[PDB]
């Protein structure tokens, strides 16, 4: 008996209700209040220039055609009811492929208050586009955006607002960071307007600010390249009479740089300009190359001009270590101070 | 007021036969297209295709959907599209495509008082384009997008671009990591299959690859090793342990470059313009080592003649490598 009372209320609301028409058609602009709870911020892909984010996307609006009076004030209904009524067609402008989870049931909620206000939330895994500028790789920072708005309703019909103050409307869970090489510093919440070829639409935007962690590249690429360059300059201390020693020493370090330069290329995304690591490796490739060219000059003058042969070898013990020191002062101050 | 609009929409959908195209048996129904490209990415040489995301709009006039007394453009819920007639437009070279469906199926239905219908879908497709990579990486491609009607012939449906050359926008905002869009072209024509003549619309871009990426990792590492092998000519010819150690290691170093570069580069199993260059550099380091062995065989019998080979090898090898580059670079550029 008591249960059937709510059945009659649900039947009455849908009787003479058309879901093809937004509330207040031809009279007023529908206001949809939106806020987001980011459950977890997924991995960021450098090669695909994308990222993943899981949100509790919440929307709210007012419909005068669903007003009712009864024993209860809030109808904690099921998602089976949602398809019967009108819901905003919110989509993500820069989304690549998003999933609306439905295990074990459609992850959607619908609550109707007595005055007609609706709350409609859902769980999503959005994969968005984040164009990047890798001119400072690996010491780079990015601001990945997330833009959503209506698809078919222009700003003369549907306008979007944040539920609370914009800063405190996109809440990120404390244990919601799946980043392993980035560092989510913070996010900013803003609003805008776009002009397509059909009309003016309202766009809600959120930017997440990241900053890559360079600890992995120091122990894997920067240090081995420094030691290999340092190792090649050791050849300036072996006496000139040991021709097989310095030639084997000189040429293997070129092979070591090639082996190191190949592996470091795998982590680099495919771009068409010079990154900050490409400048360092290319410069470190020049020092191991010039060390071997230097020995040939020293060996050529040996046994015919001994005085000059030592002079070249004596100066090179200073110039080569000094220049590499100057390079590591200009380089590490240019990129670390941006 | 609002209840009157429900009556108007109910009147239109009542008796509307979805199985009949507009003007069935009369003049063909003209459909106009707009494309607002959102992004282009994943231009892959391994699979010879590309991924294209766009806003695809179609316009046609239906007399059955005319209404009066409502001075508005009724943007209806997108699920009313299942109760209307829409063209069976499809992409001929489409390998995999889908209409985005978050948070709802990305689709727009807008009606006008005179019966005109605007129908927009947000589609992400993966169209195929054959690539002539024989000049890789100094190559130029032409990847297209073919739009055609499937079940209706030129007697029933017509296609055209809406606005002319302005029908496709958003190309200027596209930037690719490895390519640069040079020009896009719109073509309208007919294709005659075995079941009739079908209207066709074509959208074709022309991509020219960026060149500065391969200089750092592909051509410069191979050139520097080749120059290193020439150091062997300024070493005394009796230093057998030194010239051989330098001579053979460069071959190993050049081999190490090719095998790992072969993996990084896309698997394109036929001869390109980069394989010819790399093999060109592998011969020079090969001949440098083979040149010493001739010197080492005769440096004891004829020391004076052996020194002559060294002096000339310091000139012939640099001259020929620069000559090889001159023929190569002009041939492919």
């Amino acid at each position, epitope marked *: 008996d008591n249960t059937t009372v709510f059945t009659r209320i649900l039947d009455r609301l849908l009787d003479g209700y058309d879901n093809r028409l937004r509330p207040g058609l031809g009279e007023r602009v529908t206001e949809v209040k939106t806020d987001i709870f980011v459950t977890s911020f997924g991995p960021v892909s450098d090669h695909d220039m994308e990222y993943t984010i899981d949100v509790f996307f919440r929307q709210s609006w007012k419909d005068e055609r669903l007003k009712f009076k009864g024993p209860m004030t809030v109808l904690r209904l099921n998602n089976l009811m949602a398809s019967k009524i009108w819901t905003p067609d919110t989509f993500f*402008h820069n989304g690549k492929k998003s999933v609306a989870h439905n295990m074990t049931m459609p992850n959607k909620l619908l609550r109707i208050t007595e005055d007609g206000t609706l709350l409609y939330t859902m769980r999503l895994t959005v994969r968005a586009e984040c164009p990047m500028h890798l001119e400072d790789f690996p010491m780079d920072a990015h*601001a990945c955006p997330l*833009k959503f708005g209506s698809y078919a309703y222009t700003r003369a019909e549907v306008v979007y607002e944040w539920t609370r103050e914009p800063a405190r409307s996109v809440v990120v869970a404390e244990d919601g960071s799946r980043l392993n090489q980035y560092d989510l510093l913070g996010q900013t919440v803003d609003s*805008g*307007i*776009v002009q397509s070829s059909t009309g003016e639409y309202v766009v809600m935007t959120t930017h997440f*600010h990241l900053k890559r962690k360079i600890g992995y590249f120091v122990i894997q690429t920067y240090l081995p390249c420094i030691m290999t360059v340092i190792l090649s300059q050791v050849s300036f201390w072996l006496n000139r009479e040991s021709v097989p020693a310095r030639t084997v020493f000189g040429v293997t370090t070129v092979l070591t740089m090639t082996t190191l330069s190949i592996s470091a290329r795998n982590s680099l995304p495919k771009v068409a300009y010079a990154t900050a690591m490409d400048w360092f490796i290319a410069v470190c490739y020049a020092f191991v190359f010039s060390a071997l060219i230097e020995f040939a000059t020293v060996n050529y003058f040996t046994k015919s001009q001994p005085a000059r042969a030592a002079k070249i070898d004596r100066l090179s013990r200073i110039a080569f270590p000094l220049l590499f020191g100057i390079f590591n002062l200009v380089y590490w101050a240019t990129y670390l101070n941006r | 007021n609002m209840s009157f609009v429900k009556e108007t929409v109910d009147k239109l959908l009542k008796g509307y036969d979805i199985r009949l195209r507009p003007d069935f048996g009369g003049p063909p129904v003209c459909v106009g297209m707009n494309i607002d490209i959102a992004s282009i990415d994943m231009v892959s040489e391994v699979n010879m295709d590309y991924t294209l995301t766009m806003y695809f709009q179609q316009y046609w006039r239906d007399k059955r959907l005319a209404y009066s007394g409502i001075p508005l453009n009724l943007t209806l819920d997108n699920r009313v599209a299942d109760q209307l007639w829409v063209p069976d437009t499809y992409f001929l070279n489409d390998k995999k495509s889908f209409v985005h469906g978050v948070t709802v199926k990305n689709r727009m239905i807008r009606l006008h008082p005179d019966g005109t219908v605007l129908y927009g879908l947000r589609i992400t497709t993966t169209a195929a384009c054959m690539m002539d990579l024989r000049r890789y990486p100094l190559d130029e491609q032409n990847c297209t997008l073919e739009i055609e009607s499937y079940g209706y012939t030129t007697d029933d449906i017509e296609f055209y671009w809406r606005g002319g050359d302005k029908a496709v926008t958003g190309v*200027e*905002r596209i930037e690719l990591p490895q390519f640069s869009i040079v020009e896009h072209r719109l073509v309208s024509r007919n294709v005659v299959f075995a079941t009739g003549a079908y209207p066709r619309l074509s959208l074709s871009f022309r991509l020219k690859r960026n060149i500065g990426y391969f200089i750092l990792q592909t051509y410069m590492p191979s050139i520097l090793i080749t120059i290193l092998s020439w150091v062997s000519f300024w070493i005394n010819y009796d230093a057998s342990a030194a010239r051989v150690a330098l001579g053979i290691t460069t071959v190993l170093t050049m081999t190490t470059i090719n095998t790992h570069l072969r993996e990084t580069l896309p698997k394109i199993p036929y001869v390109k313009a980069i394989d010819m260059y790399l093999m060109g550099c592998f011969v020079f380091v090969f001949l440098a080592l083979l040149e010493y062995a001739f010197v080492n065989y005769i440096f004891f019998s004829q020391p004076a003649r052996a020194a002559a080979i060294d002096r000339w090898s310091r000139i012939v090898f640099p001259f020929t490598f620069s000559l090889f580059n001159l023929v190569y670079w002009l041939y492919y550029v």
Partner: nanobody
Framework: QVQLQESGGGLVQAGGSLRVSCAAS????????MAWFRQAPGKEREFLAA???????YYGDSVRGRFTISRDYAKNSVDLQLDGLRPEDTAVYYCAAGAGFWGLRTASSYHYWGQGTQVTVSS
């Protein structure tokens, strides 16, 4: 070197259109955010409008509904359409481009800047 050259400006009679343009050279700003900033004499530098790669348009509170920003991606230029100019608008307008790190409304997030364009409104 990247140069942000501006144009436009002048004197107006307490209203009327005055389109102020900008021009960029040396680097393509297709993937960057190009914005317009205003610096009243002695007060501060103030954000007016911006437009990123997706044609999303942001404005300020005191300039919404009056100033319109447009970008010509082919010519690497950004224009600001000034309408209904008020005497309080007398200031120096700047052209900026950046990646929008730590917010696109902050003047410290743009690595490039124009040379300014004086616009004076007579009451």
């Amino acid at each position: 070197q990247v140069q942000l050259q501006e144009s436009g400006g002048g004197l107006v009679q307490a209203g009327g259109s005055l389109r102020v343009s900008c021009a960029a050279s040396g680097r393509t700003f297709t993937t960057y955010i190009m914005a317009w900033f205003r610096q009243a004499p002695g007060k501060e530098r103030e954000f007016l409008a911006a437009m990123d790669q997706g044609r999303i348009q942001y404005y300020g509170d005191s300039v919404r509904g009056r100033f319109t920003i447009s970008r010509d991606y082919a010519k690497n230029s950004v224009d600001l359409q000034l309408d209904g100019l008020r005497p309080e608008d007398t200031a120096v307008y700047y052209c900026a481009a950046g990646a929008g790190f730590w917010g696109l409304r902050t003047a410290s997030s743009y690595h490039y800047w124009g040379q300014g364009t004086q616009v004076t409104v007579s009451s």
